[PDB]
Amino acid sequence: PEMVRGQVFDVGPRYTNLSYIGEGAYGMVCSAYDNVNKVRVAIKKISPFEHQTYCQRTLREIKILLRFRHENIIGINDIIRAPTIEQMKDVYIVQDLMETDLYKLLKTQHLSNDHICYFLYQILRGLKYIHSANVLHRDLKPSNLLLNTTCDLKICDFGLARVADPDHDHTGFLTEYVATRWYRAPEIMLNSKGYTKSIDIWSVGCILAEMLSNRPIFPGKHYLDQLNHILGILGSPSQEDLNCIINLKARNYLLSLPHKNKVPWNRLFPNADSKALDLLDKMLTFNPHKRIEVEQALAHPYLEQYYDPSDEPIAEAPFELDDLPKEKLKELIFEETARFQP
Known part of the structure; x- marks a missing residue:
């Protein structure tokens, strides 16, 4: 052999x-x-x-x-x-x-706005299909986005994928998690098992931010530091957002923190397309219930030159190990x- x-x-x-x-x-x-x-x-x-x-x-x-x-x-x-x-x-x-992946690409190559737009379109097109099958990827990150020499993008690494289960998403504070830290939504650290589609949209948001600056947006060094990175940028959650967190450990933790103001996206990314930043904002929404869905992201003005729902197929049928x-x-x-x- x-x-x-x-x-x-x-x-x-x-x-x-x-x-x-x-x-x-x-x-x-x-x-x-x-x-x-x-x-x-x-x-x-x-x-x-x-x-x-x-x-x-x-x-x-x-x-x-x-x-x-x-x-x-x-x-x-x-x-x-x-x-x-x-x-x-x-x-x-x-x-x-596939020649490369978005991880390798980002540590050496500046992306044009046109590349960022095209890559985001392809990520969301693939994710529309995944979600249409009632599947969550749960580990979207640059190294799980493969690219060939013409920049065709393909999502890989479904090892942590699950069937969606929004009714059984809730859990205690600081409940352990396996998917890659920097791309984990805030609710994972607070009250969520990652069994809802919004978990993936957060990851795509982090990838978009990373494509705009060639650096991860939330490089947490450990489980809780990840939440504190997110809040340093989004600012303190609103009372209304806090009201959706019923778990007391989780809510009291957030309440214990000094007030933090929002860092505006255009100050963080001064060369970004304004429509990109509008879409970024809607993907990196703290409250998972208010976070944009895959189909609405596809329909956002930023992606207007590619959006074509008839050419954005869904799975023929949805999905105990x-x-x-x-x-x-x-x-x-x-x-x-x-x-x-x-």
């Missing part, structure tokens, strides 16, 4: 000419030549079968990416594994090769990948 840096990368015969790219969640990522469709592709090696949680995240994300079909969401081209459960020790996921032992998860991963076998 093919070796890359002393580890087996066993993807042939169809995929040859391997180059190391980096590291994903449960293994090595490589590029390779697809000898069928005469193009280079990306291949991730996944080795999750030892851990219940690796299995859960792997199954969830295979299920979601196989069900989804959208220009702005990464697809699965092929899946390589052993013919039997007994011999299956890893899984290889084949995907379109929690208790399943790893043994049953491996078996479901086996079944779920069966369509790619010879």
Whole structure:
């Protein structure tokens, strides 16, 4: 079998000419030549079968990416594994090769207003489809937005995704959370489990802010510091907003803080398009109930040159892994990948 840096990368015969790219969640990522469709592709090696949680995240994300079909969401081209459960020790996921991601791009490249507008349009177009399927991504950030050499953007990394569940969103103060800190909405730290669509819109708002200045807007160094970054910019929440927080620990925390005034967006981003800042404001709204939705963001004047609802498709149909032992998860991963076998 093919070796890359002393580890087996066993993807042939169809995929040859391997180059190391980096590291994903449960293994090595490589590029390779697809000898069928005469193009280079990306291949991730996944080795999750030892851990219940690796299995859960792997199954969830295979299920979601196989069900989804959208220009702005990464697809699965092929899946390589052993013919039997007994011999299956890893899984290889084949995907379109994307040159870069918005993270890498932002640490070296200034974005034109036209690039920012186009990227935001594609992010929201993809998110419209995701939300239309009753799915929350829950980990949107620059590194999860892949881009090719013509700036086609595709959302990836559905490992933390969930089916929306707004009726069961509520929780106590400072309840632990797994998704990436800088992109977490304020309510996550106060009273929210992240089971509502507004969680994703906050993340997109943070990404928009980051595209305007090439720096994260809220670089919290730890769980609570993240909330204090947000409030340093949005200012103290209104009485009316506080009234929607019933949890006393959460509300009393906010009440204990010195009054902070809002930093105006045009002072923070003096070269930004004024329509961009209007949309940013509506995405980075403190109160999740008043935060703009994906479809309304698409309809905002900033995106007017791209908006076309007839060309912004929804999922044909909307979308219990929690208790399943790893043994049953491996078996479901086996079944779920069966369509790619010879």
